[PDB]
Structures are given as structure tokens and as C-alpha cells.
Nucleic acid binder design. Structure first.
Lengths: 190, 127
RNA sequence: GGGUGCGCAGCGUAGGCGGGAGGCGUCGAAGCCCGCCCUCCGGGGCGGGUGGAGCCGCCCAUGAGACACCGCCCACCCUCUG
RNA sequence: AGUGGCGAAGGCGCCCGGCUGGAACGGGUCCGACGGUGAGGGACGAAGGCCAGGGGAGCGAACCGGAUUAGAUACCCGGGUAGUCCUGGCUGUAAAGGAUGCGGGCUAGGUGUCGGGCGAGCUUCGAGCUCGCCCGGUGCCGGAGGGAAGCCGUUAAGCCCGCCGCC
């Protein structure tokens, strides 16, 4: 019947989701649930402009996971981020070269991450140059990891500083268009 | 207050499914298929059938209190086809007209970096 | 205990008994303003508020008549105790 | 991701590290004809199949069901066993095809691309861009010339010097 259905829908309460502290604690959205603990473990997908409205960084997607509740207010943690399909496809064209590196990182605070960085060149280049560029990416990311910690790592990786450094130092082997950091996953926590 | 949901569309050469959830995708609100609104199996993916199911789902969502909606459109993918059917755009326009506000739109057709073997038989279908 | 009733034709959810032509309005109401719950969202039952003095029915239908007022049941899904 | 590259051929595409084979370029470096082909003999050799041991997601011979059909031991649909995968061995086959045996000298060139080297100009000073030349690989056009023709044409299916296999 529809009686129990309406009963179920009307027994459901709403909760307000909140971003973490090294971001700005915002009001991403709302979640229904009957009980409080059916909400522990839930992934909100948003973009970076919604948080801080820079009109250009609309292609970045962040994923926040629910881990705690206090009344009708839930608080999140950072889980990972990835670029957008449309952006990546518009980038990777024919008669160019794509160079991707995937590395495992441990920050100053003991967080373990998997970072996937990407580079694009203007022409159909050799393979030794690919490998040199990959080594550059690796060195820079390891250095930034040993010198920085989670919050700054993520904020820089999403704002586009590490990408600028990567591009500037890889411009010594072959010029470059649209260097970027494409993905981060969190694997562990102390 | 303004609440947003998410519309997953599964489109094929044989049916169309519209499914509206909250932003988390863990709480379901409405679910309607092309096979609930016709009696011919050869009409389930007709964009009119898609329009109708979209309208039903949107009105139920509005009744429940949903105002905005993001959109993820999908084809089966994997080893099957990677191209959606013709009911997806119909459903999107119908959701727009029903009275909901629309946000982001994305395609989520799962694609194989390299994967399993499809069903043809090294010669495909021969009819 | 809190809530909960379109067999038809219907001013409309007449549910059924005994009494009840009589019941109320400062033991303050309408008409007008915004709101949670029940449910065939039918439609009422419910609350703070401009409001300051009318409205039900014996008057017709329906087999059993009034949400006319007093005591009691019942169909559900719910809140406390022992 | 290429009309591209390496490999005797079969064949070889995620990343980092180690061991290993061969070719080109550059070279007033070393030996000093040590070379070519190769009967008989040997080594490699897709898929499928066999032996022995493990594993088993998807696909799927055989098999079983539903339809289509005059019938349908098939095409279409739903399921499914060996097999496809790893270790250690056998079998020795294909449109294994450039359907074109290997080496050497000669008989117009043009235009692309891959690697290396040289010389000029640009530069954001980049293992970077452009233009030209020599060597080697790999393609598309084409004149004499050749051929039954289709077509080949300095990567000959042309004229010469050789060896083996075959009709």
C-alpha cells in the first residue's frame, strides 16, 4: 500500500552537511535519513567554484565523506578529487603526446595518498623525453610531500601551483600546454 | 529552503530508466521506466515514453519537496554499446519543463581501459 | 491515551446504538493570516493570530440523520508506564 | 597510436628497477680476403590439439532449450562443458602471402616520413622550431625500359656475374 510508504517518507528527517576545517565550513547540501547512523558513510560530490566561486575552476570535482554527526548537523572529511571527463577529452588530441605519472606519497603528518599527474606536449615526441618528464614530476611531488602536509598539499594541488612548477621545469625538455594534477586518492590515516 | 537532487538516466536501445535520488545517491525518491507507461515492448525507448516517465518522476519529486536537480546520463557501457539511446534528451527536456531547476550535466558511461571480450563470436551477428 | 470513518443520490466522511429538540457565543463564533501530523493530499481533525456576535438542526432526501448534544464500540499505523 | 618502430621469421603496446641480443650513424682506430650459396644434418616456429600438475572472472566448440521455416540437425535469443590463463614437456602445421629465394655491380628523377651526422638562420635559450646536404631504413607517384595483359618501374617483375630449391 501507500500508507506505509508515506509513513516511511514522513519519518525521515533532514540533516545539513558541512565541509571540513582547512576548507571553509560550508553548507554543501541536505540529506534525508530515519536514523543518525545510516548517514555515517556518504559521499557528497561538489565542485571547487561552488565553495570559492572562481569562475574558471569549475572542472574540478571534490568528494567529501561523512564521518560524524551532532544533532542535525553532519561534518565531512576529504577523500579525493579528480578532473572532469570533458576537460580531459578536449585536452588529449591527435598529433600530440600525453605523459601520465602515478605515485604513492606520505606527507609530513603520516597521511598516505595516491597522486596522478598529467602532462601534454605540442608534438609527437620520443619516449626518452617522456621518461625525463616523468622523472621531473616524480621529484617535484616527492619534494612537496616531504615539505608540506595534507591541507596545503591539497589546496596547492587544486589551485594550480604544483602544476605551474611542473610545467616550468619540464619546459626544459620540450614545451608544454596544460600541465595539471589530475587525481588524488586518500588511502590511509595514522 | 531549496533542495537539490540527482537524476540518473540509464538509456539503451531497448528501454530508458529515470531515477531521482538525493545528492548522496543513498536515499531514493522516485523511479520510473518506459515499461510502466506503455504496453508494446517496441516502444519502451520512444522519446515520448521517456517524456512521460520523466514527468511522473519529476512531479513525485516535487511533491516530496525537491526543487533543483543535477543530471548524470548513462549508457550500459563496458563491453556493450557506448552510445546512449534517443530517450535521454527527451527525458532531460521533460524534466526541465516539469518545473525543476537544472544544474550540472555529465555523462557517466563506464569505459574499459582494456577489458573483457564481447559477445559477437569473432564474426559478430549475421542476422 | 493522541490521532483515525466519500455503501449510493451528497449542502457531505449521514458509521452504529439509548437518551438528545434542543445546542451553544466573555465556561468570548464567525468571516479574514499565515503553519506540523492522519489519512481514498478525499477533505476535514489541529495550533498562535485583524477579528467582536452568529451558526447547527425539528425544516427535504436515506432503510436505518445529522460532525443537533450527551455515554460506548469499532480499521489501522503510533506515544508512557507496570 | 601513426600511412609509425624493433625483430630471421612467427610475432612484440601500463609504469619503475635489474640482466641480456642485434642494427644504423660518426671514425687518417685494429686484423688483413678471413667471402657467397648451401645437398645431407640442425635450431626457432600463430591458432588449435595431447601428457602431467594448478587455476577458472568474461567468452564460449559439443550439449540442452525458445523461435523462424514446407522442414531447419543453421543463421537470431537465453543458458553451458572442454578450451582460452600460469609451470614443465610433446605435436611441427596455415591465404606461415610482398602468393615475389639469397649475395654483388650497372640503367632519369620527384615528393613524404623515421634514425643518426654536418651547415645556416630563429628563439620563450628548451633533449626546442624552420630550411638545405650525406648515409641508412620504410612508403606514394612517375619518364625511358619490360611484360599476355593487370601492372612492375634504382625497395624491378630491366641488362650482367654466381649458387641452392622447385615445375
Amino acid at each position: 500500500r501507500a500508507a506505509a510508504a508515506k509513513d516511511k517518507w514522513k519519518m525521515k528527517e533532514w540533516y545539513i552537511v558541512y565541509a571540513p576545517d582547512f576548507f571553509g565550513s560550508k553548507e554543501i547540501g541536505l540529506t534525508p535519513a530515519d536514523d543518525p547512523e545510516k548517514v555515517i558513510g556518504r559521499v557528497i560530490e561538489t565542485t571547487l567554484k561552488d565553495l570559492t566561486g572562481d569562475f574558471t575552476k569549475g572542472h574540478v570535482k571534490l568528494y567529501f565523506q561523512v564521518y560524524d554527526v551532532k544533532g542535525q548537523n553532519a561534518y565531512t572529511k576529504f577523500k579525493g578529487h579528480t578532473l572532469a571527463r570533458s576537460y580531459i577529452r578536449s585536452l588529449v588530441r591527435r598529433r600530440t603526446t600525453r605523459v601520465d605519472g602515478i605515485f604513492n606519497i606520505t606527507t609530513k603528518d603520516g597521511y598516505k595518498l595516491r597522486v596522478m599527474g598529467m602532462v601534454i606536449a605540442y608534438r609527437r615526441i620520443q619516449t626518452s623525453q617522456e621518461r625525463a618528464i616523468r622523472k621531473i614530476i616524480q621529484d617535484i611531488i616527492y619534494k612537496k610531500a616531504e615539505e608540506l602536509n595534507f591541507a596545503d598539499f591539497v589546496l596547492q594541488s587544486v589551485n594550480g601551483q604544483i602544476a605551474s612548477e611542473i610545467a616550468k621545469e619540464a619546459r626544459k625538455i620540450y614545451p608544454i600546454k596544460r600541465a595539471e594534477v589530475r587525481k588524488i586518492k586518500v588511502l590511509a590515516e595514522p | 529552503k531549496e533542495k537539490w537532487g540527482v537524476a540518473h538516466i540509464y538509456s539503451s536501445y531497448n528501454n530508458t530508466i529515470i531515477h531521482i535520488t538525493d545528492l548522496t545517491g543513498a536515499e531514493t525518491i522516485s523511479r520510473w521506466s518506459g515499461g510502466m507507461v506503455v504496453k508494446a515492448d517496441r516502444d519502451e525507448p520512444s522519446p515520448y515514453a521517456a517524456m512521460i516517465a520523466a514527468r511522473r518522476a519529476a512531479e513525485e519529486a516535487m511533491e516530496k519537496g525537491i526543487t533543483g536537480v543535477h543530471i548524470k546520463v548513462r549508457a550500459p557501457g563496458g563491453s556493450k554499446s557506448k552510445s546512449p539511446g534517443p530517450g535521454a534528451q527527451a527525458a532531460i527536456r521533460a524534466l526541465s519543463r516539469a518545473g525543476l531547476r537544472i544544474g550540472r550535466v555529465e555523462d557517466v558511461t563506464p569505459i574499459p581501459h582494456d577489458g573483457t571480450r564481447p559477445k559477437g563470436g569473432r564474426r559478430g551477428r549475421r542476422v
